[PDB]
Amino acid sequence: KVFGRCELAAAMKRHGLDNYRGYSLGNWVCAAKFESNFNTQATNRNTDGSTDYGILQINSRWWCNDGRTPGSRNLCNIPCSALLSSDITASVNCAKKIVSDGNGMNAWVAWRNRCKGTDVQAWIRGCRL
Template sequence: MKALLPRPLFLLASFVVAVQAKVYERCELAKRLKDHGMDSYQGYSLANWVCLAFFESSFDTEAVARNKDGTHNFGIFQINSGWWCTYSDTASDNLCEIDCQELLHPGIEHDILCAKRIVEDPQGMAVWDEWKTHCENQNLTEWVKGCHL
């Protein structure tokens, strides 16, 4: 006997399959970021962006982290729901004017646009603690080495 899912459940299952995470390879991400104008954006090298993405999400577009203050960080750059995007009923300034769920898609265009907005603020990349800890003032050439950009 063939079991069928009720229509709403079937549609939900289809949606889940359609928005599966993508974990980028280092050079694949570097190329995508370069193609979207991230190399030297606001003075930050492409290697800075790749380093940031690695330490924030391990290049995983579907990464989500819950913070102690109740906010969440989303996507490949771990963009915070308290400031940059809106999520559920969490209060947010939504400075990127985006729903946080958009930052979880395999295509990272929304993430890139929001990251560009973030680094335009006075703190620049220093808003990301992982960047300050692992990337700032470091030799980052290895992050793009061999990528043929």
């Protein structure tokens, strides 16, 4: 599913991401924009043999199991395919664990490079939230 911007904002808010670990909703929308372009089916291979999955490009070395990644820990206890669903519940639950792991949203390199420090509230402009 390719979410609309405000559609994703509303889903993220409903699932409790607005201000989760102190990160406003616009931070999460911005991250998803640059991680996946709002496409739940996005996948991207990394050099270490892991793959990133879903709306927030969650990695198969630490977080989800894809059956082919060296050193896999499956800390979210979920198949990586669950992170491609049209329903973002599994991605949100896992993202909550990731953002709590110590480095906050810097865990998402694209957030650090493209969202951190910017006017992230722009990402929720116009939405009825």
